[PDB]
Amino acid sequence: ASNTNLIVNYLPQDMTDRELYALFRAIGPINTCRIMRDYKTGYSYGYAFVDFTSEMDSQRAIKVLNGITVRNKRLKVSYARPGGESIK
C-alpha cells in the first residue's frame, strides 16, 4: 500500500494544520493533516499528524522539516513513531 503518516511536534497547542499546509503543501503532497490535543478540555501538548502519502519525497522532507521554525519555535517531524514507535 502507500502512506507514511508523520507526526509534527513543537506545536504551540493553538497552531492549525492550515498554516502547516502553507509549508508541507509545498514540501510534500500531504493527503490529510490533523492535530492531536485533549478531546475534553482541548489541552494540547504539542504534536499532530501530517501524512505525505509519498513515503519517499516525504521522508526527505522529514529529515529537513524536522525542527523548522513557527515564528517562535521549531516544529518537529517524525515517521509517526513517538514513545518508542507506538510504545515499545
JSON list of N, CA and C in Angstrom, two decimals:
[
{"chain": "A", "resi": 1, "resn": "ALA", "atom": "N", "xyz": [0.86, -1.22, 0.00]},
{"chain": "A", "resi": 1, "resn": "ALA", "atom": "CA", "xyz": [0.00, 0.00, 0.00]},
{"chain": "A", "resi": 1, "resn": "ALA", "atom": "C", "xyz": [0.88, 1.25, 0.00]},
{"chain": "A", "resi": 2, "resn": "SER", "atom": "N", "xyz": [0.33, 2.38, 0.34]},
{"chain": "A", "resi": 2, "resn": "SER", "atom": "CA", "xyz": [1.14, 3.63, 0.36]},
{"chain": "A", "resi": 2, "resn": "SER", "atom": "C", "xyz": [0.57, 4.59, 1.41]},
{"chain": "A", "resi": 3, "resn": "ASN", "atom": "N", "xyz": [1.44, 5.31, 2.09]},
{"chain": "A", "resi": 3, "resn": "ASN", "atom": "CA", "xyz": [1.03, 6.29, 3.14]},
{"chain": "A", "resi": 3, "resn": "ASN", "atom": "C", "xyz": [1.94, 6.15, 4.36]},
{"chain": "A", "resi": 4, "resn": "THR", "atom": "N", "xyz": [2.72, 7.15, 4.64]},
{"chain": "A", "resi": 4, "resn": "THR", "atom": "CA", "xyz": [3.63, 7.10, 5.82]},
{"chain": "A", "resi": 4, "resn": "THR", "atom": "C", "xyz": [3.28, 8.25, 6.76]},
{"chain": "A", "resi": 5, "resn": "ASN", "atom": "N", "xyz": [2.10, 8.21, 7.32]},
{"chain": "A", "resi": 5, "resn": "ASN", "atom": "CA", "xyz": [1.66, 9.29, 8.25]},
{"chain": "A", "resi": 5, "resn": "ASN", "atom": "C", "xyz": [2.83, 9.73, 9.14]},
{"chain": "A", "resi": 6, "resn": "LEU", "atom": "N", "xyz": [2.97, 11.01, 9.35]},
{"chain": "A", "resi": 6, "resn": "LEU", "atom": "CA", "xyz": [4.08, 11.51, 10.20]},
{"chain": "A", "resi": 6, "resn": "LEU", "atom": "C", "xyz": [3.50, 12.25, 11.40]},
{"chain": "A", "resi": 7, "resn": "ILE", "atom": "N", "xyz": [4.35, 12.73, 12.26]},
{"chain": "A", "resi": 7, "resn": "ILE", "atom": "CA", "xyz": [3.86, 13.48, 13.45]},
{"chain": "A", "resi": 7, "resn": "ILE", "atom": "C", "xyz": [4.63, 14.79, 13.58]},
{"chain": "A", "resi": 8, "resn": "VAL", "atom": "N", "xyz": [3.94, 15.90, 13.62]},
{"chain": "A", "resi": 8, "resn": "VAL", "atom": "CA", "xyz": [4.63, 17.21, 13.76]},
{"chain": "A", "resi": 8, "resn": "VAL", "atom": "C", "xyz": [4.61, 17.62, 15.22]},
{"chain": "A", "resi": 9, "resn": "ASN", "atom": "N", "xyz": [5.75, 17.86, 15.80]},
{"chain": "A", "resi": 9, "resn": "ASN", "atom": "CA", "xyz": [5.77, 18.25, 17.24]},
{"chain": "A", "resi": 9, "resn": "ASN", "atom": "C", "xyz": [6.19, 19.71, 17.40]},
{"chain": "A", "resi": 10, "resn": "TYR", "atom": "N", "xyz": [6.42, 20.13, 18.62]},
{"chain": "A", "resi": 10, "resn": "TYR", "atom": "CA", "xyz": [6.82, 21.54, 18.87]},
{"chain": "A", "resi": 10, "resn": "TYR", "atom": "C", "xyz": [5.69, 22.48, 18.47]},
{"chain": "A", "resi": 11, "resn": "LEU", "atom": "N", "xyz": [4.47, 22.09, 18.73]},
{"chain": "A", "resi": 11, "resn": "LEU", "atom": "CA", "xyz": [3.31, 22.96, 18.37]},
{"chain": "A", "resi": 11, "resn": "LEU", "atom": "C", "xyz": [2.95, 23.84, 19.57]},
{"chain": "A", "resi": 12, "resn": "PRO", "atom": "N", "xyz": [2.42, 25.00, 19.28]},
{"chain": "A", "resi": 12, "resn": "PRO", "atom": "CA", "xyz": [2.01, 25.96, 20.32]},
{"chain": "A", "resi": 12, "resn": "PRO", "atom": "C", "xyz": [0.68, 25.54, 20.94]},
{"chain": "A", "resi": 13, "resn": "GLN", "atom": "N", "xyz": [0.13, 24.44, 20.49]},
{"chain": "A", "resi": 13, "resn": "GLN", "atom": "CA", "xyz": [-1.18, 23.98, 21.05]},
{"chain": "A", "resi": 13, "resn": "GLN", "atom": "C", "xyz": [-2.31, 24.83, 20.49]},
{"chain": "A", "resi": 14, "resn": "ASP", "atom": "N", "xyz": [-2.00, 25.81, 19.69]},
{"chain": "A", "resi": 14, "resn": "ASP", "atom": "CA", "xyz": [-3.06, 26.68, 19.11]},
{"chain": "A", "resi": 14, "resn": "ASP", "atom": "C", "xyz": [-2.87, 26.81, 17.60]},
{"chain": "A", "resi": 15, "resn": "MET", "atom": "N", "xyz": [-1.74, 26.39, 17.09]},
{"chain": "A", "resi": 15, "resn": "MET", "atom": "CA", "xyz": [-1.50, 26.48, 15.63]},
{"chain": "A", "resi": 15, "resn": "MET", "atom": "C", "xyz": [-2.54, 25.64, 14.89]},
{"chain": "A", "resi": 16, "resn": "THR", "atom": "N", "xyz": [-2.55, 25.71, 13.58]},
{"chain": "A", "resi": 16, "resn": "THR", "atom": "CA", "xyz": [-3.55, 24.92, 12.81]},
{"chain": "A", "resi": 16, "resn": "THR", "atom": "C", "xyz": [-2.86, 24.21, 11.65]},
{"chain": "A", "resi": 17, "resn": "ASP", "atom": "N", "xyz": [-3.30, 23.02, 11.33]},
{"chain": "A", "resi": 17, "resn": "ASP", "atom": "CA", "xyz": [-2.69, 22.27, 10.20]},
{"chain": "A", "resi": 17, "resn": "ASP", "atom": "C", "xyz": [-2.79, 23.12, 8.93]},
{"chain": "A", "resi": 18, "resn": "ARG", "atom": "N", "xyz": [-3.62, 24.13, 8.94]},
{"chain": "A", "resi": 18, "resn": "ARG", "atom": "CA", "xyz": [-3.76, 25.01, 7.74]},
{"chain": "A", "resi": 18, "resn": "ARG", "atom": "C", "xyz": [-2.45, 25.75, 7.51]},
{"chain": "A", "resi": 19, "resn": "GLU", "atom": "N", "xyz": [-2.00, 26.50, 8.48]},
{"chain": "A", "resi": 19, "resn": "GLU", "atom": "CA", "xyz": [-0.71, 27.21, 8.32]},
{"chain": "A", "resi": 19, "resn": "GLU", "atom": "C", "xyz": [0.35, 26.16, 8.01]},
{"chain": "A", "resi": 20, "resn": "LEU", "atom": "N", "xyz": [0.19, 25.00, 8.58]},
{"chain": "A", "resi": 20, "resn": "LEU", "atom": "CA", "xyz": [1.15, 23.89, 8.33]},
{"chain": "A", "resi": 20, "resn": "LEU", "atom": "C", "xyz": [1.11, 23.54, 6.86]},
{"chain": "A", "resi": 21, "resn": "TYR", "atom": "N", "xyz": [-0.05, 23.60, 6.30]},
{"chain": "A", "resi": 21, "resn": "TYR", "atom": "CA", "xyz": [-0.22, 23.25, 4.87]},
{"chain": "A", "resi": 21, "resn": "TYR", "atom": "C", "xyz": [0.54, 24.27, 4.03]},
{"chain": "A", "resi": 22, "resn": "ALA", "atom": "N", "xyz": [0.63, 25.47, 4.50]},
{"chain": "A", "resi": 22, "resn": "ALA", "atom": "CA", "xyz": [1.38, 26.51, 3.74]},
{"chain": "A", "resi": 22, "resn": "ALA", "atom": "C", "xyz": [2.83, 26.05, 3.57]},
{"chain": "A", "resi": 23, "resn": "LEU", "atom": "N", "xyz": [3.28, 25.18, 4.44]},
{"chain": "A", "resi": 23, "resn": "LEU", "atom": "CA", "xyz": [4.68, 24.68, 4.36]},
{"chain": "A", "resi": 23, "resn": "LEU", "atom": "C", "xyz": [4.71, 23.33, 3.65]},
{"chain": "A", "resi": 24, "resn": "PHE", "atom": "N", "xyz": [4.08, 22.36, 4.25]},
{"chain": "A", "resi": 24, "resn": "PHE", "atom": "CA", "xyz": [4.05, 20.98, 3.69]},
{"chain": "A", "resi": 24, "resn": "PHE", "atom": "C", "xyz": [3.46, 20.99, 2.28]},
{"chain": "A", "resi": 25, "resn": "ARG", "atom": "N", "xyz": [2.34, 21.63, 2.10]},
{"chain": "A", "resi": 25, "resn": "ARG", "atom": "CA", "xyz": [1.72, 21.66, 0.75]},
{"chain": "A", "resi": 25, "resn": "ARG", "atom": "C", "xyz": [2.79, 22.01, -0.29]},
{"chain": "A", "resi": 26, "resn": "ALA", "atom": "N", "xyz": [3.85, 22.63, 0.12]},
{"chain": "A", "resi": 26, "resn": "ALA", "atom": "CA", "xyz": [4.93, 23.00, -0.85]},
{"chain": "A", "resi": 26, "resn": "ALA", "atom": "C", "xyz": [6.04, 21.94, -0.78]},
{"chain": "A", "resi": 27, "resn": "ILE", "atom": "N", "xyz": [6.24, 21.36, 0.36]},
{"chain": "A", "resi": 27, "resn": "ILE", "atom": "CA", "xyz": [7.30, 20.32, 0.50]},
{"chain": "A", "resi": 27, "resn": "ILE", "atom": "C", "xyz": [6.79, 18.99, -0.05]},
{"chain": "A", "resi": 28, "resn": "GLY", "atom": "N", "xyz": [5.81, 18.42, 0.59]},
{"chain": "A", "resi": 28, "resn": "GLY", "atom": "CA", "xyz": [5.26, 17.12, 0.11]},
{"chain": "A", "resi": 28, "resn": "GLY", "atom": "C", "xyz": [3.76, 17.26, -0.13]},
{"chain": "A", "resi": 29, "resn": "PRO", "atom": "N", "xyz": [3.23, 16.39, -0.95]},
{"chain": "A", "resi": 29, "resn": "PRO", "atom": "CA", "xyz": [1.80, 16.37, -1.29]},
{"chain": "A", "resi": 29, "resn": "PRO", "atom": "C", "xyz": [1.00, 15.72, -0.15]},
{"chain": "A", "resi": 30, "resn": "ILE", "atom": "N", "xyz": [0.88, 16.40, 0.96]},
{"chain": "A", "resi": 30, "resn": "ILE", "atom": "CA", "xyz": [0.13, 15.82, 2.10]},
{"chain": "A", "resi": 30, "resn": "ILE", "atom": "C", "xyz": [-1.25, 15.35, 1.63]},
{"chain": "A", "resi": 31, "resn": "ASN", "atom": "N", "xyz": [-1.77, 14.33, 2.24]},
{"chain": "A", "resi": 31, "resn": "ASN", "atom": "CA", "xyz": [-3.13, 13.84, 1.85]},
{"chain": "A", "resi": 31, "resn": "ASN", "atom": "C", "xyz": [-4.12, 14.20, 2.97]},
{"chain": "A", "resi": 32, "resn": "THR", "atom": "N", "xyz": [-3.62, 14.47, 4.14]},
{"chain": "A", "resi": 32, "resn": "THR", "atom": "CA", "xyz": [-4.53, 14.83, 5.28]},
{"chain": "A", "resi": 32, "resn": "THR", "atom": "C", "xyz": [-3.69, 15.43, 6.41]},
{"chain": "A", "resi": 33, "resn": "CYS", "atom": "N", "xyz": [-4.22, 16.37, 7.15]},
{"chain": "A", "resi": 33, "resn": "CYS", "atom": "CA", "xyz": [-3.43, 16.97, 8.26]},
{"chain": "A", "resi": 33, "resn": "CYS", "atom": "C", "xyz": [-4.34, 17.21, 9.48]},
{"chain": "A", "resi": 34, "resn": "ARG", "atom": "N", "xyz": [-4.09, 16.52, 10.56]},
{"chain": "A", "resi": 34, "resn": "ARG", "atom": "CA", "xyz": [-4.93, 16.72, 11.78]},
{"chain": "A", "resi": 34, "resn": "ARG", "atom": "C", "xyz": [-4.02, 17.10, 12.95]},
{"chain": "A", "resi": 35, "resn": "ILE", "atom": "N", "xyz": [-4.58, 17.56, 14.04]},
{"chain": "A", "resi": 35, "resn": "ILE", "atom": "CA", "xyz": [-3.74, 17.94, 15.21]},
{"chain": "A", "resi": 35, "resn": "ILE", "atom": "C", "xyz": [-4.20, 17.12, 16.42]},
{"chain": "A", "resi": 36, "resn": "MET", "atom": "N", "xyz": [-3.29, 16.69, 17.25]},
{"chain": "A", "resi": 36, "resn": "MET", "atom": "CA", "xyz": [-3.72, 15.88, 18.43]},
{"chain": "A", "resi": 36, "resn": "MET", "atom": "C", "xyz": [-3.74, 16.76, 19.69]},
{"chain": "A", "resi": 37, "resn": "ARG", "atom": "N", "xyz": [-4.82, 16.70, 20.42]},
{"chain": "A", "resi": 37, "resn": "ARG", "atom": "CA", "xyz": [-4.93, 17.51, 21.67]},
{"chain": "A", "resi": 37, "resn": "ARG", "atom": "C", "xyz": [-6.07, 16.94, 22.52]},
{"chain": "A", "resi": 38, "resn": "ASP", "atom": "N", "xyz": [-6.05, 17.18, 23.80]},
{"chain": "A", "resi": 38, "resn": "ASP", "atom": "CA", "xyz": [-7.13, 16.64, 24.68]},
{"chain": "A", "resi": 38, "resn": "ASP", "atom": "C", "xyz": [-8.49, 16.86, 24.01]},
{"chain": "A", "resi": 39, "resn": "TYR", "atom": "N", "xyz": [-9.28, 15.83, 23.90]},
{"chain": "A", "resi": 39, "resn": "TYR", "atom": "CA", "xyz": [-10.62, 15.98, 23.25]},
{"chain": "A", "resi": 39, "resn": "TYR", "atom": "C", "xyz": [-11.65, 16.44, 24.28]},
{"chain": "A", "resi": 40, "resn": "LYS", "atom": "N", "xyz": [-11.25, 16.60, 25.51]},
{"chain": "A", "resi": 40, "resn": "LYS", "atom": "CA", "xyz": [-12.22, 17.05, 26.55]},
{"chain": "A", "resi": 40, "resn": "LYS", "atom": "C", "xyz": [-12.05, 18.56, 26.79]},
{"chain": "A", "resi": 41, "resn": "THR", "atom": "N", "xyz": [-10.94, 18.95, 27.35]},
{"chain": "A", "resi": 41, "resn": "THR", "atom": "CA", "xyz": [-10.72, 20.40, 27.61]},
{"chain": "A", "resi": 41, "resn": "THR", "atom": "C", "xyz": [-9.96, 21.03, 26.44]},
{"chain": "A", "resi": 42, "resn": "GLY", "atom": "N", "xyz": [-9.40, 20.22, 25.59]},
{"chain": "A", "resi": 42, "resn": "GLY", "atom": "CA", "xyz": [-8.64, 20.76, 24.43]},
{"chain": "A", "resi": 42, "resn": "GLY", "atom": "C", "xyz": [-7.20, 21.06, 24.84]},
{"chain": "A", "resi": 43, "resn": "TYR", "atom": "N", "xyz": [-6.81, 20.61, 26.00]},
{"chain": "A", "resi": 43, "resn": "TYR", "atom": "CA", "xyz": [-5.41, 20.86, 26.46]},
{"chain": "A", "resi": 43, "resn": "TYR", "atom": "C", "xyz": [-4.43, 20.21, 25.49]},
{"chain": "A", "resi": 44, "resn": "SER", "atom": "N", "xyz": [-3.81, 21.00, 24.65]},
{"chain": "A", "resi": 44, "resn": "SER", "atom": "CA", "xyz": [-2.85, 20.43, 23.67]},
{"chain": "A", "resi": 44, "resn": "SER", "atom": "C", "xyz": [-1.46, 20.34, 24.31]},
{"chain": "A", "resi": 45, "resn": "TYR", "atom": "N", "xyz": [-0.63, 19.46, 23.83]},
{"chain": "A", "resi": 45, "resn": "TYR", "atom": "CA", "xyz": [0.74, 19.33, 24.42]},
{"chain": "A", "resi": 45, "resn": "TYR", "atom": "C", "xyz": [1.81, 19.47, 23.33]},
{"chain": "A", "resi": 46, "resn": "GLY", "atom": "N", "xyz": [1.41, 19.73, 22.11]},
{"chain": "A", "resi": 46, "resn": "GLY", "atom": "CA", "xyz": [2.41, 19.90, 21.02]},
{"chain": "A", "resi": 46, "resn": "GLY", "atom": "C", "xyz": [2.65, 18.56, 20.31]},
{"chain": "A", "resi": 47, "resn": "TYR", "atom": "N", "xyz": [1.93, 18.31, 19.25]},
{"chain": "A", "resi": 47, "resn": "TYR", "atom": "CA", "xyz": [2.10, 17.03, 18.50]},
{"chain": "A", "resi": 47, "resn": "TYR", "atom": "C", "xyz": [0.86, 16.79, 17.63]},
{"chain": "A", "resi": 48, "resn": "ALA", "atom": "N", "xyz": [1.06, 16.52, 16.36]},
{"chain": "A", "resi": 48, "resn": "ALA", "atom": "CA", "xyz": [-0.10, 16.32, 15.45]},
{"chain": "A", "resi": 48, "resn": "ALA", "atom": "C", "xyz": [0.25, 15.26, 14.40]},
{"chain": "A", "resi": 49, "resn": "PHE", "atom": "N", "xyz": [-0.64, 15.04, 13.47]},
{"chain": "A", "resi": 49, "resn": "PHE", "atom": "CA", "xyz": [-0.38, 14.03, 12.40]},
{"chain": "A", "resi": 49, "resn": "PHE", "atom": "C", "xyz": [-0.40, 14.69, 11.02]},
{"chain": "A", "resi": 50, "resn": "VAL", "atom": "N", "xyz": [0.65, 14.54, 10.27]},
{"chain": "A", "resi": 50, "resn": "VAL", "atom": "CA", "xyz": [0.69, 15.11, 8.89]},
{"chain": "A", "resi": 50, "resn": "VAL", "atom": "C", "xyz": [1.21, 14.02, 7.95]},
{"chain": "A", "resi": 51, "resn": "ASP", "atom": "N", "xyz": [0.37, 13.50, 7.10]},
{"chain": "A", "resi": 51, "resn": "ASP", "atom": "CA", "xyz": [0.83, 12.42, 6.19]},
{"chain": "A", "resi": 51, "resn": "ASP", "atom": "C", "xyz": [1.24, 13.00, 4.84]},
{"chain": "A", "resi": 52, "resn": "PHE", "atom": "N", "xyz": [2.25, 12.44, 4.24]},
{"chain": "A", "resi": 52, "resn": "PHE", "atom": "CA", "xyz": [2.70, 12.94, 2.91]},
{"chain": "A", "resi": 52, "resn": "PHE", "atom": "C", "xyz": [2.23, 11.98, 1.82]},
{"chain": "A", "resi": 53, "resn": "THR", "atom": "N", "xyz": [1.76, 10.81, 2.21]},
{"chain": "A", "resi": 53, "resn": "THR", "atom": "CA", "xyz": [1.30, 9.81, 1.21]},
{"chain": "A", "resi": 53, "resn": "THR", "atom": "C", "xyz": [2.35, 9.67, 0.10]},
{"chain": "A", "resi": 54, "resn": "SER", "atom": "N", "xyz": [3.57, 10.02, 0.40]},
{"chain": "A", "resi": 54, "resn": "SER", "atom": "CA", "xyz": [4.65, 9.89, -0.60]},
{"chain": "A", "resi": 54, "resn": "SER", "atom": "C", "xyz": [5.54, 8.73, -0.19]},
{"chain": "A", "resi": 55, "resn": "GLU", "atom": "N", "xyz": [5.84, 8.64, 1.08]},
{"chain": "A", "resi": 55, "resn": "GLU", "atom": "CA", "xyz": [6.68, 7.52, 1.58]},
{"chain": "A", "resi": 55, "resn": "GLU", "atom": "C", "xyz": [8.06, 7.58, 0.92]},
{"chain": "A", "resi": 56, "resn": "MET", "atom": "N", "xyz": [8.37, 8.69, 0.31]},
{"chain": "A", "resi": 56, "resn": "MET", "atom": "CA", "xyz": [9.70, 8.85, -0.34]},
{"chain": "A", "resi": 56, "resn": "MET", "atom": "C", "xyz": [10.09, 10.33, -0.25]},
{"chain": "A", "resi": 57, "resn": "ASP", "atom": "N", "xyz": [9.51, 11.14, -1.09]},
{"chain": "A", "resi": 57, "resn": "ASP", "atom": "CA", "xyz": [9.82, 12.59, -1.03]},
{"chain": "A", "resi": 57, "resn": "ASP", "atom": "C", "xyz": [9.49, 13.07, 0.38]},
{"chain": "A", "resi": 58, "resn": "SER", "atom": "N", "xyz": [8.48, 12.48, 0.96]},
{"chain": "A", "resi": 58, "resn": "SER", "atom": "CA", "xyz": [8.09, 12.85, 2.35]},
{"chain": "A", "resi": 58, "resn": "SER", "atom": "C", "xyz": [9.26, 12.58, 3.29]},
{"chain": "A", "resi": 59, "resn": "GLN", "atom": "N", "xyz": [9.77, 11.38, 3.27]},
{"chain": "A", "resi": 59, "resn": "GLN", "atom": "CA", "xyz": [10.92, 11.04, 4.16]},
{"chain": "A", "resi": 59, "resn": "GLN", "atom": "C", "xyz": [11.99, 12.13, 4.05]},
{"chain": "A", "resi": 60, "resn": "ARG", "atom": "N", "xyz": [12.28, 12.57, 2.86]},
{"chain": "A", "resi": 60, "resn": "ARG", "atom": "CA", "xyz": [13.30, 13.65, 2.71]},
{"chain": "A", "resi": 60, "resn": "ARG", "atom": "C", "xyz": [12.82, 14.88, 3.47]},
{"chain": "A", "resi": 61, "resn": "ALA", "atom": "N", "xyz": [11.58, 15.23, 3.28]},
{"chain": "A", "resi": 61, "resn": "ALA", "atom": "CA", "xyz": [11.01, 16.41, 4.00]},
{"chain": "A", "resi": 61, "resn": "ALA", "atom": "C", "xyz": [11.00, 16.12, 5.50]},
{"chain": "A", "resi": 62, "resn": "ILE", "atom": "N", "xyz": [11.11, 14.88, 5.86]},
{"chain": "A", "resi": 62, "resn": "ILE", "atom": "CA", "xyz": [11.12, 14.51, 7.30]},
{"chain": "A", "resi": 62, "resn": "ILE", "atom": "C", "xyz": [12.50, 14.80, 7.88]},
{"chain": "A", "resi": 63, "resn": "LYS", "atom": "N", "xyz": [13.53, 14.60, 7.11]},
{"chain": "A", "resi": 63, "resn": "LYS", "atom": "CA", "xyz": [14.90, 14.89, 7.61]},
{"chain": "A", "resi": 63, "resn": "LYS", "atom": "C", "xyz": [15.11, 16.40, 7.60]},
{"chain": "A", "resi": 64, "resn": "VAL", "atom": "N", "xyz": [14.37, 17.10, 6.78]},
{"chain": "A", "resi": 64, "resn": "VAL", "atom": "CA", "xyz": [14.52, 18.58, 6.71]},
{"chain": "A", "resi": 64, "resn": "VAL", "atom": "C", "xyz": [13.52, 19.25, 7.66]},
{"chain": "A", "resi": 65, "resn": "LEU", "atom": "N", "xyz": [12.27, 19.25, 7.31]},
{"chain": "A", "resi": 65, "resn": "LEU", "atom": "CA", "xyz": [11.23, 19.89, 8.17]},
{"chain": "A", "resi": 65, "resn": "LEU", "atom": "C", "xyz": [11.51, 19.60, 9.65]},
{"chain": "A", "resi": 66, "resn": "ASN", "atom": "N", "xyz": [12.08, 18.47, 9.95]},
{"chain": "A", "resi": 66, "resn": "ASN", "atom": "CA", "xyz": [12.36, 18.15, 11.37]},
{"chain": "A", "resi": 66, "resn": "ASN", "atom": "C", "xyz": [13.04, 19.34, 12.05]},
{"chain": "A", "resi": 67, "resn": "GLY", "atom": "N", "xyz": [12.31, 20.10, 12.83]},
{"chain": "A", "resi": 67, "resn": "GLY", "atom": "CA", "xyz": [12.92, 21.26, 13.52]},
{"chain": "A", "resi": 67, "resn": "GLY", "atom": "C", "xyz": [12.98, 22.48, 12.59]},
{"chain": "A", "resi": 68, "resn": "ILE", "atom": "N", "xyz": [11.86, 22.95, 12.11]},
{"chain": "A", "resi": 68, "resn": "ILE", "atom": "CA", "xyz": [11.88, 24.14, 11.22]},
{"chain": "A", "resi": 68, "resn": "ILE", "atom": "C", "xyz": [11.70, 25.41, 12.07]},
{"chain": "A", "resi": 69, "resn": "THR", "atom": "N", "xyz": [10.67, 26.19, 11.85]},
{"chain": "A", "resi": 69, "resn": "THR", "atom": "CA", "xyz": [10.50, 27.42, 12.68]},
{"chain": "A", "resi": 69, "resn": "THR", "atom": "C", "xyz": [9.06, 27.93, 12.62]},
{"chain": "A", "resi": 70, "resn": "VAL", "atom": "N", "xyz": [8.39, 28.01, 13.74]},
{"chain": "A", "resi": 70, "resn": "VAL", "atom": "CA", "xyz": [6.99, 28.52, 13.74]},
{"chain": "A", "resi": 70, "resn": "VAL", "atom": "C", "xyz": [6.96, 29.97, 14.22]},
{"chain": "A", "resi": 71, "resn": "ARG", "atom": "N", "xyz": [7.72, 30.83, 13.60]},
{"chain": "A", "resi": 71, "resn": "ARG", "atom": "CA", "xyz": [7.72, 32.26, 14.01]},
{"chain": "A", "resi": 71, "resn": "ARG", "atom": "C", "xyz": [7.98, 32.37, 15.52]},
{"chain": "A", "resi": 72, "resn": "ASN", "atom": "N", "xyz": [8.51, 31.34, 16.14]},
{"chain": "A", "resi": 72, "resn": "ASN", "atom": "CA", "xyz": [8.76, 31.43, 17.61]},
{"chain": "A", "resi": 72, "resn": "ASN", "atom": "C", "xyz": [9.40, 30.13, 18.12]},
{"chain": "A", "resi": 73, "resn": "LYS", "atom": "N", "xyz": [9.11, 29.02, 17.49]},
{"chain": "A", "resi": 73, "resn": "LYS", "atom": "CA", "xyz": [9.70, 27.74, 17.96]},
{"chain": "A", "resi": 73, "resn": "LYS", "atom": "C", "xyz": [10.22, 26.94, 16.76]},
{"chain": "A", "resi": 74, "resn": "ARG", "atom": "N", "xyz": [10.29, 25.64, 16.88]},
{"chain": "A", "resi": 74, "resn": "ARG", "atom": "CA", "xyz": [10.79, 24.82, 15.74]},
{"chain": "A", "resi": 74, "resn": "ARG", "atom": "C", "xyz": [9.96, 23.53, 15.63]},
{"chain": "A", "resi": 75, "resn": "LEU", "atom": "N", "xyz": [9.07, 23.46, 14.68]},
{"chain": "A", "resi": 75, "resn": "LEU", "atom": "CA", "xyz": [8.23, 22.23, 14.53]},
{"chain": "A", "resi": 75, "resn": "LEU", "atom": "C", "xyz": [9.10, 20.98, 14.52]},
{"chain": "A", "resi": 76, "resn": "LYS", "atom": "N", "xyz": [8.49, 19.84, 14.62]},
{"chain": "A", "resi": 76, "resn": "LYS", "atom": "CA", "xyz": [9.25, 18.56, 14.59]},
{"chain": "A", "resi": 76, "resn": "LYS", "atom": "C", "xyz": [8.60, 17.67, 13.54]},
{"chain": "A", "resi": 77, "resn": "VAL", "atom": "N", "xyz": [9.27, 16.66, 13.07]},
{"chain": "A", "resi": 77, "resn": "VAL", "atom": "CA", "xyz": [8.64, 15.78, 12.05]},
{"chain": "A", "resi": 77, "resn": "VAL", "atom": "C", "xyz": [9.23, 14.37, 12.12]},
{"chain": "A", "resi": 78, "resn": "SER", "atom": "N", "xyz": [8.42, 13.40, 12.43]},
{"chain": "A", "resi": 78, "resn": "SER", "atom": "CA", "xyz": [8.93, 12.00, 12.51]},
{"chain": "A", "resi": 78, "resn": "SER", "atom": "C", "xyz": [8.03, 11.08, 11.68]},
{"chain": "A", "resi": 79, "resn": "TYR", "atom": "N", "xyz": [8.44, 9.86, 11.48]},
{"chain": "A", "resi": 79, "resn": "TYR", "atom": "CA", "xyz": [7.61, 8.91, 10.68]},
{"chain": "A", "resi": 79, "resn": "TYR", "atom": "C", "xyz": [6.53, 8.28, 11.57]},
{"chain": "A", "resi": 80, "resn": "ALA", "atom": "N", "xyz": [5.86, 9.08, 12.36]},
{"chain": "A", "resi": 80, "resn": "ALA", "atom": "CA", "xyz": [4.79, 8.55, 13.25]},
{"chain": "A", "resi": 80, "resn": "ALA", "atom": "C", "xyz": [5.34, 7.41, 14.11]},
{"chain": "A", "resi": 81, "resn": "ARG", "atom": "N", "xyz": [6.20, 7.72, 15.04]},
{"chain": "A", "resi": 81, "resn": "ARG", "atom": "CA", "xyz": [6.76, 6.66, 15.92]},
{"chain": "A", "resi": 81, "resn": "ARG", "atom": "C", "xyz": [7.19, 7.27, 17.26]},
{"chain": "A", "resi": 82, "resn": "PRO", "atom": "N", "xyz": [6.26, 7.92, 17.91]},
{"chain": "A", "resi": 82, "resn": "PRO", "atom": "CA", "xyz": [6.50, 8.57, 19.22]},
{"chain": "A", "resi": 82, "resn": "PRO", "atom": "C", "xyz": [6.48, 7.53, 20.35]},
{"chain": "A", "resi": 83, "resn": "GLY", "atom": "N", "xyz": [7.00, 7.88, 21.49]},
{"chain": "A", "resi": 83, "resn": "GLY", "atom": "CA", "xyz": [7.01, 6.93, 22.64]},
{"chain": "A", "resi": 83, "resn": "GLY", "atom": "C", "xyz": [7.51, 5.56, 22.19]},
{"chain": "A", "resi": 84, "resn": "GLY", "atom": "N", "xyz": [8.71, 5.49, 21.67]},
{"chain": "A", "resi": 84, "resn": "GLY", "atom": "CA", "xyz": [9.25, 4.18, 21.22]},
{"chain": "A", "resi": 84, "resn": "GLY", "atom": "C", "xyz": [8.34, 3.58, 20.15]},
{"chain": "A", "resi": 85, "resn": "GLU", "atom": "N", "xyz": [8.12, 4.30, 19.08]},
{"chain": "A", "resi": 85, "resn": "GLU", "atom": "CA", "xyz": [7.24, 3.77, 17.99]},
{"chain": "A", "resi": 85, "resn": "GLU", "atom": "C", "xyz": [5.97, 3.18, 18.60]},
{"chain": "A", "resi": 86, "resn": "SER", "atom": "N", "xyz": [4.91, 3.94, 18.66]},
{"chain": "A", "resi": 86, "resn": "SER", "atom": "CA", "xyz": [3.63, 3.42, 19.23]},
{"chain": "A", "resi": 86, "resn": "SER", "atom": "C", "xyz": [3.92, 2.58, 20.47]},
{"chain": "A", "resi": 87, "resn": "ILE", "atom": "N", "xyz": [4.80, 3.04, 21.32]},
{"chain": "A", "resi": 87, "resn": "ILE", "atom": "CA", "xyz": [5.13, 2.27, 22.55]},
{"chain": "A", "resi": 87, "resn": "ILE", "atom": "C", "xyz": [6.07, 1.11, 22.19]},
{"chain": "A", "resi": 88, "resn": "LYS", "atom": "N", "xyz": [7.02, 0.81, 23.03]},
{"chain": "A", "resi": 88, "resn": "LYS", "atom": "CA", "xyz": [7.95, -0.31, 22.73]},
{"chain": "A", "resi": 88, "resn": "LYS", "atom": "C", "xyz": [8.99, -0.42, 23.86]}
]
